[PDB]
Amino acid sequence: DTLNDVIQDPTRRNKLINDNNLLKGIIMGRDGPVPSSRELIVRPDTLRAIINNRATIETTTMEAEFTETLMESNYNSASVKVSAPCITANSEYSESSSFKNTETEKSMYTSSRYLFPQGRIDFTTPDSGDVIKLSPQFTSGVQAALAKATGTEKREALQNLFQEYGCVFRTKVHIGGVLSAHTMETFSRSENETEVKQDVKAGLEGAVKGWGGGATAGHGNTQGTITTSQNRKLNVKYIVNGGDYTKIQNTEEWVASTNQSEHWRVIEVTEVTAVADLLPQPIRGQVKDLLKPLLGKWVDVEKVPGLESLPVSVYRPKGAIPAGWFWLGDTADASKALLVKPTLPARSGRNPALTSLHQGSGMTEQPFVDLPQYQYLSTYFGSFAHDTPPGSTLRGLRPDHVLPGRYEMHGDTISTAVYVTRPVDVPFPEDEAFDLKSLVRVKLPGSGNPPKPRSALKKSMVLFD
Ligand SMILES: [Cl-]
Ligand SMILES: [Cl-]
Ligand SMILES: [Cl-]
Ligand SMILES: [Cl-]
Ligand SMILES: [Cl-]
Ligand SMILES: [Cl-]
């Protein structure tokens, strides 16, 4: 009946907590977001709730790759944001993804959800408050991991802990029923981004409005095609959550079932908190430091010879590179270069932080990532070979490690012109990036060259001292 009653009655409420896995952390993987089999927090006898019967249509637009299953799970932008690094790191990479970001093309996900809510449930973060308590078993696993003797053993234990419990926990969820449509769009960079985003959003919102309004043929989960006002053909995935699915073929009956508590499910993930952030200091900081996939070391550099025609000097770390450490590309930094070292051992099924590189088969001397979808920061000034220094110690990066950078172009002629990559200079960045002055050649000879880097390394991924 009413949501307020549910929270009161322990049996109605526990069915709500259990059927929706509200105590479970979320595991990100190749198939998407999966509830842990273990409970992460202590079960409360009552839930913080905010009543809302107001049906609305919301729309989320997303340019971040690897987030499609989260979009289909009705995560909002903020929830996708927090969850992005985890799912990116745990995704199954491939060279043949329909999602494509190139020099000419750009892709994005758009999801529209017709909500039929009953309210929103919030789990208070430690800053009370109603405050949640981490499970004794979980906080035990943490203590045990931190009690290990060597760094690797500590980190390896933390990974198992998080692989088991999950990387994020849903701290705010809406419940009820939902009819949602999800699509991906790939478009030329020569198009107006605003126009494409509004055009897709309008077409997708119109589709779900007709669905939940009862003006279109009723239907459950299925795939289809819609056409925008600008004649864009979109492949759409329709998803239903909550309510009685046996009644979905008749939309209005479906909507009526939304008022039945037995059929309420999560219809939107509104806020997500990284599990580690549920920890009190200084345990929180110890874990997060250990979780960092790379160690960092600033070393001196040396100018590269053969680059007198170039508008700037090119620098590489001064040999010899300490064994087990790697560099990330030619820089214009004459003072220091960053070396990195992976903190986690390579294991089958695990996406390593770094990838080695190999020279292209075509008419190019530029490196290509061995591992699909991995990224590097600089063009290679010279001829790359994986078996010869310094290319032998050069490494690419797992996609979660990088953000888009920005070019500062130098040169009086294109053929010698270079881009110097800086962190993006938006005033309030969510993820802070290293300034590495990664060097990118403006025009490369000749086609067969890999896509041009414009990336910056996240500081949150590198552990110092
Ligand atoms: Cl899914
Ligand atoms: Cl709570
Ligand atoms: Cl469901
Ligand atoms: Cl190749
Ligand atoms: Cl690249
Ligand atoms: Cl840019």
Author numbering: 53 to 181, 184 to 519
Sentences from the paper on this structure:
To gain further insight into the structural conversions in pore formation, we chose pleurotolysin (Ply), a MACPF protein consisting of two components, PlyA and PlyB, from Pleurotus ostreatus. Previous studies have shown that PlyA binds membranes and is required to recruit the pore-forming MACPF protein PlyB to the membrane surface. PlyA and PlyB together form relatively small and regular pores in liposomes. The membrane attack complex/perforin-like family (MACPF) proteins form the largest superfamily of pore-forming proteins identified to date.
To probe the mechanism of pore assembly, we engineered a series of disulphide bonds to limit movement in either TMH1 or TMH2. As performed for perfringolysin O and other CDCs, the TMH regions were trapped by introducing cross-links to the central sheet or other adjacent regions in the monomer structure. This trapping allows oligomer assembly but prevents the TMH region from unfolding enough to insert into the membrane. The disulphide trap mutants were engineered on a background PlyB variant that lacks the wild type cysteine (C487A) in order to avoid incorrect disulphide bond formation. Oxidised TMH1 variant PlyBF138C,H221C (TMH1 lock) possessed no detectable lytic activity, but reduction of the disulphide restored wild type lytic activity. The crystal structure of the TMH1 trapped variant was determined and is otherwise indistinguishable from the wild type.
